[PDB]
Amino acid sequence: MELTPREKDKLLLFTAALVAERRLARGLKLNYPESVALISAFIMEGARDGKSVASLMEEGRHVLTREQVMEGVPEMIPDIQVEATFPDGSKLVTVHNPII
Amino acid sequence: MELTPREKDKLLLFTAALVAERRLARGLKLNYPESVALISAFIMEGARDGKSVASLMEEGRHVLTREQVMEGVPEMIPDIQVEATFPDGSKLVTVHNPII
Amino acid sequence: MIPGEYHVKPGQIALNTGRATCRVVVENHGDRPIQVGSHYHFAEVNPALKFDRQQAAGYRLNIPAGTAVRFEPGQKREVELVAFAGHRAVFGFRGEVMGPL
Amino acid sequence: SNISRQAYADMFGPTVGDKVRLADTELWIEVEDDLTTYGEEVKFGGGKVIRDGMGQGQMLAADCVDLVLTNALIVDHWGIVKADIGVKDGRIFAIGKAGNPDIQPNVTIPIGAATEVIAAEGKIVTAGGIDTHIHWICPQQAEEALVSGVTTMVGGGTGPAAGTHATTCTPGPWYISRMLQAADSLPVNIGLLGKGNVSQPDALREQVAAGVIGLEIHEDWGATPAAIDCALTVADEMDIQVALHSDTLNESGFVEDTLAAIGGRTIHTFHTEGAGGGHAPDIITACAHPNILPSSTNPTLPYTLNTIDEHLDMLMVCHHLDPDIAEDVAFAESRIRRETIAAEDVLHDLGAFSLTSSDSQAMGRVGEVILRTWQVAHRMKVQRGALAEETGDNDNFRVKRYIAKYTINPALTHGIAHEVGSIEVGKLADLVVWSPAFFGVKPATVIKGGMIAIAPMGDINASIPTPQPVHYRPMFGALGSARHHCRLTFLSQAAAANGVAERLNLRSAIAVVKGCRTVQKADMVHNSLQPNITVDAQTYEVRVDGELITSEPADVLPMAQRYFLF
Amino acid sequence: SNISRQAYADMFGPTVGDKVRLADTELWIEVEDDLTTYGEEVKFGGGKVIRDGMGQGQMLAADCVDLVLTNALIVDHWGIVKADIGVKDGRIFAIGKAGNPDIQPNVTIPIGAATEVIAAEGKIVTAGGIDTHIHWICPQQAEEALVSGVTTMVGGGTGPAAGTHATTCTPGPWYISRMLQAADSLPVNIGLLGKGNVSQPDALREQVAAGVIGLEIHEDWGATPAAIDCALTVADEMDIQVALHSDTLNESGFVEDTLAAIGGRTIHTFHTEGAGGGHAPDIITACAHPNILPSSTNPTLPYTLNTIDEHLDMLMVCHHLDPDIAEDVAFAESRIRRETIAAEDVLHDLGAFSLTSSDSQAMGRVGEVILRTWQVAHRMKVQRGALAEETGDNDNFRVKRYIAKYTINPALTHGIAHEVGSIEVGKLADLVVWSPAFFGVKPATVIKGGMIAIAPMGDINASIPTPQPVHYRPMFGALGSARHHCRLTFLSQAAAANGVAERLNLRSAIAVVKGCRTVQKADMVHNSLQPNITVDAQTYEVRVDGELITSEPADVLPMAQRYFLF
Amino acid sequence: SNISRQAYADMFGPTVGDKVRLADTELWIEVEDDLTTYGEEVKFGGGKVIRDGMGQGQMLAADCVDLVLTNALIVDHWGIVKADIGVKDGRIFAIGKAGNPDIQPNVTIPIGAATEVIAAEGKIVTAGGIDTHIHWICPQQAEEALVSGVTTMVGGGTGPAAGTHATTCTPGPWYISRMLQAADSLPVNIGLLGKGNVSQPDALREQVAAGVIGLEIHEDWGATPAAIDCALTVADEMDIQVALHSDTLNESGFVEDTLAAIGGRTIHTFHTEGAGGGHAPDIITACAHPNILPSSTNPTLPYTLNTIDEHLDMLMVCHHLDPDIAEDVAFAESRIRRETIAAEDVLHDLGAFSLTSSDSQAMGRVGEVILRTWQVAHRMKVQRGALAEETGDNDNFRVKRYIAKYTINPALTHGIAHEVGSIEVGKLADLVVWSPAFFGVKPATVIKGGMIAIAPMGDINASIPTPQPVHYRPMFGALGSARHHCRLTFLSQAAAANGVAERLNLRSAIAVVKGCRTVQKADMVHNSLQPNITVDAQTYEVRVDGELITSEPADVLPMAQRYFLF
């Protein structure tokens, strides 16, 4: 595989997201780290799929709603950023006010 | 649990495989690291099940086909090797030309 | 498209050109197999291999570097040798020369 | 006897005339020369050539090399040849034919009992990369960079502080001393840059005397003509380099005023295209001057479909700008221009831009300098075809032109070329072994000072080092005292004389910079073009000799999704 | 010109009169003062104030600070004010107005070319915490503690051995020497405690001469009146501190006998509430004496619904007790009393208990000292309202009272207040930057000795340091020699005189303890109450002046599930 | 008073006559002796024995031990007894009865204020393992090995280079110096082997003078009679050991010729069975000679159902052989013989093979030396029953015979037995604490030089060290300077005299090897059998005195799937 440090670091993000994904499934209101991990993981898979940065900057705001997260959480996340390998190399996706 | 370094290292392989497994499910053509992780994880579970080294050296060549992976990927993997605890201790499984 | 693929031009490579060679018939009189390397001083191989050791003095196998010739018990075969170069000083092996020649 | 070419390549790697594809790109190299004597190649393994009295001699340690890289395919600015590489005393001893002079002909690299062996047959060997635009935002960058193939890092910073987030300045004597001490812990060669934004010379001299090998003039600290002139005056007297990030705001003047302040004195212009900073919108015109050594930062290399979309927000965070403050966002579309981004790629292919760097974590990606340089080369071959300098049916010249951008040129620019930058005898043995299929993406072996510092490693408890999971892990060359002995801390001639190394009790080997003032555009290997370039103030179009310079955005690139897990 | 208050706060942070909520608690602070001159605030970034000739001067390094924390909201025992913080030589230089005296008014903290910048606008800055009850069960505790905001750790141990599992004693000269050497590798200030349980003075003197800054009397090693008197005699002559864990079993006598043995001599009583150890069931009555400096361990802070259920088994494992041995379990309900646990919270709010600590991995959580202290403050405001000392409509006084518990007071108690404990000029620059929304939970920046030692860091290969995944990673201040230069190893005056540092070849900066014998309850900042407290032998009820002291168990707490992944 | 045996075992561990099962194997040990005085056992914890004036004395540090392991069940080549272990100055002080001479009878190990305590009641304590066949392919091997219970590692290499992949040779002065420096960073005792494949003595002498404690003759570098004789001549004059990997190819002669070249001189034969290398197919006959010290590598231990299937490809990768080259694969079935693999297990049970090793990452598993040795013992008891030397209804003798294989014997073979290898007074305190249920699989505590270097550790932030997740983490004994003080770098007498340690500026404690030439088969503890063994050239059958030696392949083994997550 020859995993570089950055690839191993993203495995931490992926795994953190597996935790959030399962809790949301049980019908829990996600907390701060769970929300960030869940939305971040979403974007990475979007890039793997070949979606453009522009599309993800939009879609990332429709992963979780204000009623699916704990109080105060939406305001604790003015934005979310994550990079991934798109078909045209690594790119940065910035999602402003992801939770509404 | 008393996890040793080797057990914790294999958790990285397992997790890398969870990523590939999900992408394959979406119908994506797997890349180099995804392919290696997926086939490797398969073999480890085979050992946990009690399958013999000889059986796995064969079965490991039928996990992914040339049409399920990106171009060039089959040639980037002349073989795959991974060790696991079989009922008779740790053993090495070498799968030659796993993707055909 | 194959990542890192070679595009080797067709043809052949002539090895150890311009050097003295000689053919020798060798027979394994031992009960166990014997494998000889490309750069090993032939005149000092396993004593179980019977051949004209005198002729093979200062020679090695005329085969591509890194390869070998195997002799199963009782096997007999003719091999081609090529003379050592450089200082033509043999050191080591069975310690029969340990010097120039 | 005789052996077919194919079988020969499978055993010892390609030879004269054979071509090799670089990773999954369209770039092909052709072996220009082979220094071996057919039939006399050295190989290691059970029953192979390198054995006592055969391929190994009887000489003492002083008469043989410490390490030999057998059957290597060297790719350097000077040639693409096949040869054995000899390493002695942590430095490159020779490039030739290895073996035992006792029985083999033409041996120039003697192998004895004191010789270790690295099998490079079928691999490409290159010099370690040199990134001259590092922001020391975190120590983890060194490993990331080392894994990618970069063995020397030049820049500055004190950690995750605002100043370092935006600039590469290691502010003052105290922080400089602190970072020099911290450098002994990193497995890469290091040289620091101080804050050159001051109009009082003594404030700069102290920093140089403290240990920095250069000064950065950054607009965030005020890139005024007064500061620029001050930094260049001190640089001229202390033989250190100046790196510039000009006045994007045109607050003190336009590009022509900055150029006027420079006054034909040597200077390295950072991210000359402008996206990363510089007079809007024509800082790119700097590459036309003889005293300017221009480089690019990697996020704009090469021009792709998502380049623009990504930059808008990246800029803000880096330079501490406020998206609500009109004036802070107004200079976004002024700094991010599709026009210059597209042109930059071509200017690189033409040799107008001589260096590539990262600009680590401040509008740049530390582990992608080599990767992106090759992606540019690929996209340029695809769009423009063979270079006017190409000979034969290969991309050999284009490969030499581009490899020089992150190797020898960065070294010449910062006065360290006497120590690193290329595979030449006498230089430190910072080498990288690549498998052709992973060239520029994931290294097989990274050698620092003659010791492997990092490499992919499988199951530690396995019966062999190949079983999964295989990922990059630190090796002996990156351990304590062995590390100190295999890395270099570059100091300014003044710092070296002042005894800074002894006072701070530095443990690593020391190297001194020199020749920073004398280098000029014409010295940049394969990248000395001084084009008559202009930029339209309104349309931002870039023109050379009146002709329009531009390129198309890539939708898919090589060395991307086929290699990375994320 | 003019700017609205809201826009002003968004740019430079809150000013006089503005209130800020602490994390997700009910505690609100109000800016008491602002040291700036409106319109003259320094800000860093592209086109901002801190630039040559503007907010940055022409002075030499000796005439300006090395680091400046701009627009910080300081929260310390002495005040809650807005100011710039200047750091020079690894120590706090000044708290005032930063800038360039050449063009700005009232500059007390000069910024020059040698000055690094940390943007603190909108952040809360505090002194690093000090935990005086560490069991060195594992080296990993230092990082965990540093990440939470604690920069100094006092305790003892040799690793995961039975003795250290239960006590904080570093037994004898050999282990003391070994741990002092091992301390150079840790990114926190450290001071060791030796085993004070002996009735032969010379056995204690050796340990103090070996390097310990205190001695712990623990019942597991026999907390007899003879041992107590012995330790206090040596402490009195060597100016070191004594930490007590009294005789829970009442084997040698009751609490009044232990107090009698102490004989009005200065002593720090560990986990004074008793759950963690001490005369059953009235060790809590110790807080009424002038010579007693009482602290709490964190598992009982604050009283919640699950507190009791959890303790029963935690106690056993820590002290190597046997659940099958009747006598070993009999003293469970004797050591775990709902009555004292509830009272402890109130006694803290009243200033009867002066310190909070962890008791790391031995009935305590190393990364939760700060977090739990604030949870107590929250629960007390909720249940008891404003303190009699409050002024205005804020919790400013309660905030100063509680922050002192894990900062200045622990420092006064162990004779290290001259070096750390608060944001005061001359003290080591151990600071923690907090975002108001994560105050007391997850720090934005942790500074040690003037260098960032740890902070949250995103994708190392990203174009900026903000992309996910963001988690805590070691910085330059925690690297090799830079670390040594930014941390302190506290020695006893005797050890310092004996040349212990030179003999063990310690690499870090050395500090000496002093004033351990002269401190008394009245010296504890904002926590000097000596209540007339009694405990009912039968019912365990705690009473002060006859009135019943108690509180209700919390079902949900702030700084909990909203911030943690697990 | 009186206490039942069962209750007694539950409190202080088993006593004389009680038996204990080793992990999940069929091996049972029986306590042969108990050095305690019933009713006077020392125990630590709240209200226990080790307290001032009781089980703890008033003596000064010089008159008591630094560490005491209470109620330990010692399993060593000399006995299986119950006792307290005293550790002083990093070395084993005594094996006896610990306590306070003031009030207790028969105290030989005094406990005072300077004494730390490790509770070993119910645990098995053994000496740290010694692996004499390490390939330094990566630094991560040290941790893996330490976690398994091996505290000393002998071998060579420079990292992931071809030479080290196949051999354990640290080629020449430069690499030797580099590895000696890098060794200070590893938490295990280390000694290096140089490349002994040369026919010029001075080339070997330089290496020995450089610091190696042995020389390896490997067929990959040419194991010719000339080289063998040369290495043995130098070994004889410099008192260092020679490790052999003979000529599998029979290129220079057969096994009898190699034996002839050895000329009755002391030599350690690596993987004597042959699978890992050696004259095909009879290298195993070497174990019949008095001057031969034979060892096994672990992949062939013990003979199981998957042993053969796995070896075919493992061999290729290790020795850089080509599966397409007929001659390279031809010697596969010649090196991998079911016949010798099955016999090796029996020869171990008989004491014909005296050592077990790994052959780390080159046809061996670094973390499985101890684990596999016990699996062999289990399989041999199952197949052959009690040994002729057994007494009583236990496997005590078989346990002593097998533990000696990876402890005292490897130490005698390499001239380091004066420092490590067994639990004897005066030797370095390298001990491993095991819970009977995890014996040989996962250690409870690993002690190096008197300090815990690694142990399982739970949640760092937990209230106790037991909560999940529990996994192995580095402790204080593995930290910076404490590490240096607790580990040994073994040098050759020549290197020590030359001042190599001072020149390379080695920080760890130095030990010198001696007695490598004088050891012979008869000195191997419990493994001195010199059998009249023969191997059939055609059928490969192994015979001793004409009788056929063989065993059956195991389908399931203990210490496997019940303990490992993967």
From Swiss-Prot, chains A, B:
Subunit structure: Heterotrimer of UreA (gamma), UreB (beta) and UreC (alpha) subunits. Three heterotrimers associate to form the active enzyme. The apoenzyme interacts with an accessory complex composed of UreD, UreF and UreG, which is required for the assembly of the nickel containing metallocenter of UreC. The UreE protein may also play a direct role as a metallochaperone in nickel transfer to the urease apoprotein.
Location in or out of the cell: Cytoplasm
Highest taxon, organism lineage: Bacteria
Notes on activation and inhibition: The apoenzyme can be activated in vitro in the presence of nickel ions and carbon dioxide, which promotes carbamylation of 'Lys-217' of the UreC (alpha) subunit.
An MF annotation (GO) of this entry: nickel cation binding
Entry's EC annotation: 3.5.1.5
Keywords: Cytoplasm, Hydrolase
Designated name of the protein: Urease subunit gamma
Pfam families xrefs: Urease_gamma (PF00547)
Reactions it catalyzes: urea + 2 H2O + H(+) = hydrogencarbonate + 2 NH4(+)
Family per record: Belongs to the urease gamma subunit family.
Database matches in InterPro entries: Urease_gamma, Urease_gamma/gamma-beta_su, Urease_gamma_sf, Urease_subunit
GO biological process: urea catabolic process
pH dependence remark: Optimum pH is 7.75.
GO cellular component terms listed in the entry, alphabetical order: cytoplasm
Organism: Klebsiella aerogenes
Listed SUPFAM superfamilies: Urease, gamma-subunit
Pathway(s) annotated for this protein in UniProt: Nitrogen metabolism; urea degradation; CO(2) and NH(3) from urea (urease route): step 1/1
UniProtKB/Swiss-Prot annotation, chain C:
Activity regulation comment: The apoenzyme can be activated in vitro in the presence of nickel ions and carbon dioxide, which promotes carboxylation of 'Lys-217' of the UreC (alpha) subunit.
Localization in the cell: Cytoplasm
Description of pH dependence: Optimum pH is 7.75.
GO molecular function (one): urease activity
Pfam families: Urease_beta
UniProt entry tagged with the keyword Cytoplasm: yes
GO cellular component, one term: urease complex
Pathway(s) served: Nitrogen metabolism; urea degradation; CO(2) and NH(3) from urea (urease route): step 1/1
EC number(s) per entry: 3.5.1.5
Cytoplasm among keywords: yes
InterPro entries, sorted: Urease_beta-like, Urease_betasu_sf, Urease_subunit
UniProt keywords, alphabetically: Cytoplasm, Hydrolase
Family under the similarity heading: Belongs to the urease beta subunit family.
This protein's name: Urease subunit beta
The species this protein was found in: Klebsiella aerogenes
Gene: ureB
UniProtKB/Swiss-Prot annotation, chains D, E, F:
GO cellular component: cytoplasm
One Pfam entry name: Amidohydro_1
Residues reported to bind Ni(2+) 1: 133, 135, 216, 359
Its EC number(s): 3.5.1.5
Positions with a binding annotation for Ni(2+) 2: 216, 245, 271
Cofactor binding comment, as recorded: Binds 2 nickel ions per subunit.
Domain of life of the native organism: Bacteria
Post-translational modification note: Carboxylation allows a single lysine to coordinate two nickel ions.
Subcellular location: Cytoplasm
Cofactor dependence: Ni cation
Disulfide bonds: none
Listed result of changing residue 335 to Q: Reduces activity 10000-fold, but has no effect on KM
Effect on the protein of changing residue 319 to A: Reduces activity 100000-fold, but increases KM only 3-fold; optimum pH is 6.75. Resistant to inactivation by diethylpyrocarbonate and iodoacetamide
A biological-process GO annotation: urea catabolic process
InterPro entries cross-referenced by the UniProt entry: Amidohydro-rel, Metal-dep_hydrolase_composite, Metal_Hydrolase, Urease_alpha_N_dom, Urease_alpha_subunit, Urease_AS, Urease_asu, Urease_asu_c
Pathway: Nitrogen metabolism; urea degradation; CO(2) and NH(3) from urea (urease route): step 1/1
Reaction(s) this enzyme catalyzes, per UniProt: urea + 2 H2O + H(+) = hydrogencarbonate + 2 NH4(+)
Comment on pH dependence: Optimum pH is 7.75.
Family the entry assigns: Belongs to the metallo-dependent hydrolases superfamily. Urease alpha subunit family.
HAMAP family: Urease_alpha (MF_01953)
Protein name: Urease subunit alpha
Protein's organism: Klebsiella aerogenes
Gene name for this UniProt entry: ureC
